[PDB]
Amino acid sequence: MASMKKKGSVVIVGRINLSGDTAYAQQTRGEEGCQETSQTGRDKNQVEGEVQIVSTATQTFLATSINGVLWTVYHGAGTRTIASPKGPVTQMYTNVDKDLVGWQAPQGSRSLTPCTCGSSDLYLVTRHADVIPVRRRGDSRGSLLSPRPISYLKGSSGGPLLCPAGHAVGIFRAAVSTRGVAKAVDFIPVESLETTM
Ligand SMILES: CCCCCOC(=O)N[C@H]1CCCCC/C=C\[C@@H]2C[C@@]2(C(=O)NS(=O)(=O)C2(C)CC2)NC(=O)[C@@H]2C[C@@H](Oc3nc4cc(OC)ccc4nc3C)CN2C1=O
Numbered sequence: 001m002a003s004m005k006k007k008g009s010v011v012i013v014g015r016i017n018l019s020g021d022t023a024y025a026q027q028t029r030g031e032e033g034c035q036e037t038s039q040t041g042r043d044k045n046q047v048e049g050e051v052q053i054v055s056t057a058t059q060t061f062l063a064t065s066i067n068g069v070l071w072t073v074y075h076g077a078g079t080r081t082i083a084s085p086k087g088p089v090t091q092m093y094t095n096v097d098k099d100l101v102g103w104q105a106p107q108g109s110r111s112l113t114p115c116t117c118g119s120s121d122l123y124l125v126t127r128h129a130d131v132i133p134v135r136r137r138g139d140s141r142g143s144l145l146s147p148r149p150i151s152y153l154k155g156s157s158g159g160p161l162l163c164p165a166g167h168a169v170g171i172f173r174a175a176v177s178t179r180g181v182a183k184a185v186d187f188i189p190v191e192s193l194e195t196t197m
């Protein structure tokens with residue numbers, strides 16, 4: 001018992017910048033400072049933007065602020081705390097059946113607004129700042145207009161699907177693949193987030 005370890009916190013290590021005309025990824029913390037911030041849970045870095053790049057000791061993925069909650073996938077974060085200036089922050093939402101977790105949105109973040117447009121012309125934002133057109137095909141499915149090998153989507157779970165007006169429609173959860181090519185995506189609808197809230 002006296003040697004039992006504790007899992008570290010999720011750590012914000014960058015963001016997808018969507019403030020201007022060009023989307024691009026930014027790193028805000030290197031691997032060494034990440035490992036150390038994960039152990040202490042104390043992250044004094046300024047947070048900005050809607051889409052964060054997050055990491056554990058073993059995985060990297062995305063997290064998206066919607067309605068003052070930073071949302072991501074359970075298969076990336078598990079039950080982990082997230083690092084903050086004052087120490088580890090405990091999850092506010094956890095739903096393994098939806099592959100969903102959430103923490104209070106960090107100070108300085110900006111939150112996306114839940115989409116009420118009812119539109120099926122969507123856009124997926126990846127960890128590499130690619131904006132991928134996606135046609136909505138169901139409550140939790142959308143097809144890529146230009147299929148990609150799954151390699152290009154790996155590490156983007158927790159990222160947003162957006163409507164033409166930039167509202168949040170869903171959280172990227174899983175890739176639908178045949179022989180390594182992503183033809184469609186599975187996502188957590190924003191309405192399922194609003195119900196969890
Ligand atoms: C079929 C259509 C729907 C399902 C069928 O489709 C698939 O399963 N396809 C698979 C294809 C895997 C090949 C790579 C696909 C490329 C990018 C994908 C975007 C994304 C990601 O980037 N991840 S990640 O950032 O790299 C990273 C690993 C976090 C670091 N996602 C996943 O890899 C998920 C995890 C797991 O799926 C679940 N795991 C769960 C685990 C839980 O508790 C542990 C609870 C609920 C879960 N619910 C679910 C649904 C399997 N994934 C798939 O996409």
Ligand SMILES: [Zn+2]
Pocket residue numbers: 114115116117118163164165166167168
């Ligand atoms: Zn909208």
